[PDB]
UniProtKB/Swiss-Prot annotation, chain A:
Record organism: Saccharomyces cerevisiae (strain ATCC 204508 / S288c) (Baker's yeast)
Family: Belongs to the TCP-1 chaperonin family.
N-terminal signal peptide: none
Gene: CCT5
Assembly mode: Heterooligomeric complex of about 850 to 900 kDa that forms two stacked rings, 12 to 16 nm in diameter.
Identification of the protein by name: T-complex protein 1 subunit epsilon
PANTHER family: CHAPERONIN (PTHR11353)
Curated annotation (Swiss-Prot), chain B:
Positions in coiled-coil regions: none
Protein name per UniProt: T-complex protein 1 subunit beta
SUPFAM superfamilies, per the entry: GroEL apical domain-like (SSF52029), GroEL equatorial domain-like (SSF48592), GroEL-intermediate domain like (SSF54849)
Taxonomic lineage from the root: Eukaryota, Fungi, Dikarya, Ascomycota, Saccharomycotina
GO MF annotation: an example: ATP-dependent protein folding chaperone
Stored InterPro entries: Chap_CCT_beta, Chaperone_TCP-1, Chaperonin_TCP-1_CS, Cpn60/GroEL/TCP-1, GroEL-like_apical_dom_sf, GROEL-like_equatorial_sf, TCP-1-like_intermed_sf
Pfam families: Cpn60_TCP1 (PF00118)
Gene assigned in the entry: CCT2
Complexes and interactors: Heterooligomeric complex of about 850 to 900 kDa that forms two stacked rings, 12 to 16 nm in diameter. Interacts with PLP2; this interaction leads to inhibition of CCT complex mediated actin folding.
UniProtKB/Swiss-Prot annotation, chain C:
Family: Belongs to the TCP-1 chaperonin family.
Protein name, entry field: T-complex protein 1 subunit delta
Assembly and interaction partners: Heterooligomeric complex of about 850 to 900 kDa that forms two stacked rings, 12 to 16 nm in diameter.
Subcellular locations according to the entry: Cytoplasm
Source organism (scientific name): Saccharomyces cerevisiae (strain ATCC 204508 / S288c)
The protein's role, per its UniProt record: Molecular chaperone; assists the folding of proteins upon ATP hydrolysis. Known to play a role, in vitro, in the folding of actin and tubulin. In yeast may play a role in mitotic spindle formation.
Organism domain of life: Eukaryota
Additional note from the record: Present with 5530 molecules/cell in log phase SD medium.
Length: 522, 513, 48
């Protein structure tokens, strides 16, 4: 335990995360770079994501918990463009260091941010556009314009046309005709390492690591004679020869009683296969294993089955097939049968393990993007990049207002807060301008990684937005030349920038109020 | 605590040298003329000598993350080519080395360097597609070109001098599969002893087991049955049962009921009309004598991998629940006899009912060649099976990399700007891949490669490098050709993996637990 | 076992001449078949 008072724990505590957050600063925007982080277990995770790095990174100062606690709420709120947003989350604490040297009270610094935060949002509401005013066709065209700037962020952005139709067609299957709804829970992306990254397709369903046991039949049967969705079924109770699970004892007083125990399972072997054959269910998933003597009769009756399937994947199958998993053998009925359009096992590599793929060609509740790639490290990075796209469309649904991206929002509200600071006067004039000054570091940081003059671009933005009130002029991240964002189809959700900046401002209010740091062991 | 972090200054230099240091071991393994390496394991004191880095780089501990992704992508190469796949790590190491010299000279931002490799990879796909030749239209030349495709892919191991004896093995075996891409159908057995050229291709199955006591070593016109039922351990139950008896009289009746259990079980087996029986587990003495009384062969101790290969090669089916004798199928072979291959005699099958699979007999001088021939035959017919699916092929052997250099150089003129430096760097690094190949045979990589470079620009596509004579020879005359599907995945994955390694500005080392 | 040491001194002299290892291995492989034909020509008949 150390004794820290005064500017010791009121400055270096903020300066700590200031040097830590400057590490990921080089990853801002599509021009950013990746990083290597070795886990304590020895594994290595390579990603540029600000939330993924800070989650598994073990630091010293307790301020790291404040940065992770914010990212926990951001994933459930916005979680869109994490590489872009994570940099501006710490930009509010950098400007507060200059106001402390000037003699402003730390609480007056924190209270001055919330005053200018409500006025900056009102200015952003002027230039926002309503995408919901159009039809469904123009709405999907707005998604294609947004999926270019928004969806593509990290690596694999080389070819963005392969994943463009993946995110667009994913929200088309599950959506309301009035364009108010979201479900991101039934959409799960399970990828594999193989082939090329351009081989990704759209297959709605789940990918099971376990294949069909008893390699004495065909790997996949595409059609079905009974039609009606192949009659998918899942048994909740484990599949075993029936025996009491509770403690019991057997008493054999004669040879005949021992012979009846032989025909005991023999009568149950035929009883279990006939109840399934009577229902005609082709796909029967056993949760825990199966009986060795029944490993044949399933193929004899043409009953493909699998073993050791996780309960999480079983929930997505029943909701996708619109069926109900069978809780009890006596409760087995044709009313609980599911609907499966096509089921097959992917060849994957040479041998390896064949991956069972359940696919529904029609509208289904479980939407999945088929993903294959050569690099193993890009798997978790490319999936989580498209996982945020589920919340991107969600921001366009719940919030019909959309603003032009490219850092043009912070420049637009910069001129408003500068004018609103002169109305209050007092000591808050420099405090309100400081809140807008911290937001002015975002455009200068965007041009840092691209090799463009930070101020030379920022000076043109305020000069151009002075004559015309349109916000389409913004920072050019990828080097497209002219800074008009309307021709480049660069748009960002309104609620995305709203909450992520507001929640960061609300959190920094309590951070600047920290004076003494007391750390005790667990 | 104890977290060592390197900024863009240290991490940029440390990440590039990491792949170059370990990459020097796989540079000499390129091509049929490539060399091998040795690894000393601290556990069991074993070693693996091979030119394929999938089993080399995986067992080499390394603290540089730059080569960690290179090992994971080797499984993709293990699922496609499998032989001579070290060029993926060699070409990636050259891209990291040329980019290291490109940032020290041009001093452009690393993201711009990646944008140059993105436009350079597009020109490489156009040169391979326009040069793709499809001979599948003529079935006569198709079966003959499979030998030329084989001669390229089947030279890896030290035994490649025997390829002329081994070319007939993969030629007739791919014709027997008729579309079987799985290695579980292909029967690969290892035999110690005999000459290196003694390996032959026999039609049938070879079993390493034997007959227990009275089973005749030669059985003709036999019905082969495969059963997963339990024999050796008998009574083992696993019920909730317990045993209570008043006197030893009924105690022996339980053993008498055990005989009646097996007597009624062999009665259902006798209804099958089989002269051959196979079990997954061991066979108890009592049913072993019952097999000899009824004239039924006995085979035991077939593991999970071997129980399938019996029915897959012979076309049979694993049968359980004997209560349905006529609902299943029975395997059949013309001649079932015990032969002697090497020291351990083996059980030979002849005249299988289904020719869907074949058995390749492998005899070699040393144990080092056992796992060495396994790696060469790991992907052998599967490579030929992928040529059955994708029939477009292109001349390989180092010339195809020079043909793509002409397309990249042509595209570099239309691009120009400051991004052409990274585009030209990809062409310069690609031309160094056959240069290292010429360095492995000890021949001239200067004058020969310089002539091959001007020959591609003169409009001669068939020009290539001769490995045996060390001169300029046409690949169509030597018979060196590779499929379009394999080479496309090698060049693309090497460039995609190199884009990630150039993006590392930081290396964080956590304190070990 | 003595056959292993007979090729140790012969290999060291050839590596000093600057010959590629595969050429040395291919020369011994071609000479191996030549040594077999010598033993076959010198093979004498024997009763069963």
């Amino acid at each position: 335990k150390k004794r820290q008072h005064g500017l010791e724990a009121k400055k270096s505590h903020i300066l700590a995360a200031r040097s830590v957050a400057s590490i990921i600063k080089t990853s801002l925007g599509p021009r950013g770079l990746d990083k290597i982080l070795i886990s304590p277990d020895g594994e290595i995770t390579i990603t540029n994501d600000g939330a993924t790095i800070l989650s598994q990174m073990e630091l010293d100062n307790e301020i790291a918990k404040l940065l992770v606690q914010l990212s926990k709420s951001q994933d459930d709120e916005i979680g869109d463009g994490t590489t872009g947003v994570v940099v501006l989350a710490s930009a509010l604490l950098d400007q507060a260091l200059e106001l402390i040297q000037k003699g402003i009270h730390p609480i007056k610094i924190a209270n001055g941010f919330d005053e200018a935060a409500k006025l900056a949002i009102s200015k952003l509401e002027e230039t926002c556009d309503d995408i919901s005013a159009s039809n469904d066709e123009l709405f999907r065209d707005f998604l294609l314009r947004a999926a270019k700037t928004s969806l593509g962020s990290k690596i694999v952005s080389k070819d963005h046309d392969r994943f463009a139709e993946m995110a667009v067609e994913a929200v088309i299957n599950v959506m309301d005709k009035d364009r108010k709804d979201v479900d991101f829970d039934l959409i799960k992306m399970q990828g594999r390492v193989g082939g090329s990254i351009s081989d990704s397709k759209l297959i709605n369903g789940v990918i099971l690591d376990k294949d069909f046991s008893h390699p004495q039949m065909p790997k996949c049967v595409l059609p079905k004679e009974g039609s009606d969705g192949v009659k998918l079924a899942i048994l909740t109770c484990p599949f075993e020869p029936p025996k009491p699970k509770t403690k019991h004892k057997l008493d054999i007083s004669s040879v005949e009683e021992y012979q009846k125990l032989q025909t005991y399972e023999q009568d149950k072997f035929k009883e279990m296969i006939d109840d399934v054959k009577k229902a005609g269910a082709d796909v029967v998933i056993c949760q825990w294993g199966f009986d060795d003597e029944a490993n044949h009769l399933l193929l004899q009756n043409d009953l493909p089955a699998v073993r050791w399937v996780g309960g999480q994947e079983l929930e997505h199958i029943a909701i996708s097939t619109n069926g109900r998993i069978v809780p009890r053998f006596q409760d087995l009925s044709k009313d609980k049968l599911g609907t499966c359009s096509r089921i097959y096992e992917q060849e994957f590599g040479t041998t390896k393990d064949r991956m069972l793929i359940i696919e529904q060609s029609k509208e289904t509740k479980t939407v999945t993007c088929f993903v294959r790639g050569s690099n193993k490290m890009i798997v978790d990075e490319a999936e989580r990049a498209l996982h945020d796209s589920l919340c991107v469309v969600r921001n366009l649904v719940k919030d019909s207002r959309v603003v032009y991206g490219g850092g043009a929002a912070e420049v637009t509200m910069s001129l408003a807060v500068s004018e609103e600071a002169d109305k209050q006067r007092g000591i808050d004039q420099y405090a309100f301008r400081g809140f807008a000054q911290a937001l002015d570091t975002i455009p200068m940081t965007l041009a840092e990684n691209s090799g463009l003059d930070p101020i030379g671009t920022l000076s043109t933005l305020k000069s151009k937005q002075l004559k015309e009130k349109i916000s389409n002029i913004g920072v050019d991240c990828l080097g497209y030349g002219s800074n008009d964002m309307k021709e480049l189809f660069v748009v960002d959700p309104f609620i995305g920038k709203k909450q992520q900046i507001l929640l960061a401002t609300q959190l920094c209010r309590m951070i600047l109020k920290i004076d003494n740091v007391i750390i005790s062991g667990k | 605590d104890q977290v060592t972090e390197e900024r863009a200054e240290n991490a940029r230099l440390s990440a590039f040298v990491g792949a170059i240091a370990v990459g020097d071991l796989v540079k000499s393994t390129l091509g049929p003329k490539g060399m091998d390496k040795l690894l000393q394991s601290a556990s069991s004191n074993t070693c693996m000598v091979t030119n394929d880095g999938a089993t080399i780089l995986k067992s080499i501990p390394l603290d540089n993350p730059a080569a960690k992704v290179l090992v994971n992508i080797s499984k993709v190469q293990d699922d496609e080519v499998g032989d001579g796949t070290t060029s993926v790590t060699v070409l990636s190491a050259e891209l990291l080395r040329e980019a290291e010299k490109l940032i020290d000279q041009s001093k452009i931002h690393p993201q711009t360097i990646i944008e140059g490799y993105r436009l350079a990879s597009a020109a490489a796909l156009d040169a391979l597609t326009k040069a793709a030749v499809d001979n599948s239209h003529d079935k006569t030349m198709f079966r003959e070109d499979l030998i030329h495709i084989a001669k390229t892919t089947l030279s890896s191991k030290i035994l490649s001098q025997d390829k002329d004896h081994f070319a007939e093995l993969a030629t007739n075996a791919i014709l027997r599969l008729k579309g079987s891409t799985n290695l579980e159908h292909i029967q690969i057995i290892k035999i110690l002893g005999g000459k290196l050229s003694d390996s032959f291709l026999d039609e049938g199955f070879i079993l390493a087991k034997k007959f227990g006591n009275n089973q005749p070593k030669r059985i003709e016109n036999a019905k082969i049955l495969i059963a997963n039922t339990t024999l050796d351990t008998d009574k083992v139950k696993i019920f909730g049962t317990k045993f209570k008896v008043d006197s030893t009289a009924k105690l022996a009746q339980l053993e008498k009921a055990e005989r009646e259990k097996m007597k009624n079980k062999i009665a259902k087996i006798s209804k099958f009309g089989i002269n051959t029986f196979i079990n997954r587990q061991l066979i108890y003495d009592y049913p072993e004598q019952l097999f000899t009384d009824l004239g039924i062969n006995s085979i035991e101790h077939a593991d999970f991998e071997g129980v399938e290969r019996l029915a897959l090669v012979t076309g049979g089916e694993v049968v359980s629940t004997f209560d349905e004798p006529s609902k299943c199928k029975l395997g059949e072979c013309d001649v079932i006899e015990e032969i002697m291959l090497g020291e351990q005699p083996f059980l030979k099958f002849s005249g299988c009912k289904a020719g869907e699979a074949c058995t390749i007999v492998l005899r070699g001088a040393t144990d080092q060649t056992l796992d060495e021939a396994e790696r060469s035959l790991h992907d052998a017919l599967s490579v030929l099976s992928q040529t059955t699916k994708e029939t477009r092929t292109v001349l390989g052997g180092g010339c195809a990399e020079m043909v793509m250099s002409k397309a990249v150089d042509t595209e570099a003129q239309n691009i120009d700007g400051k991004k052409s430096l990274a585009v030209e760097a990809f062409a310069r690094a690609l031309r160094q891949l056959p240069t290292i190949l010429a360095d492995n045979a000890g021949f001239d990589s200067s004058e020969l490669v310089s002539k091959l470079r001007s020959s591609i620009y003169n409009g001669i596509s068939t020009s290539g490098l001769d490995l045996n004579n060390g001169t300029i020879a046409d690949m169509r005359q030597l018979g060196i050709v590779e499929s379009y599907k394999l080479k496309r995945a090698v060049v693309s994955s090497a460039s995609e993996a190199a884009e990630v390694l150039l993006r590392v500005d930081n290396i964080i080392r956590a304190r070990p637990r | 076992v003595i056959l292993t040491g007979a090729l140790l001194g012969a290999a060291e002299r050839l590596l000093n001449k600057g010959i590629h290892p595969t050429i040395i291995a291919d020369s011994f492989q071609s000479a191996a078949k030549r040594s077999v034909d010598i033993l076959l020509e010198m093979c004498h008949k024997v009763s069963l």
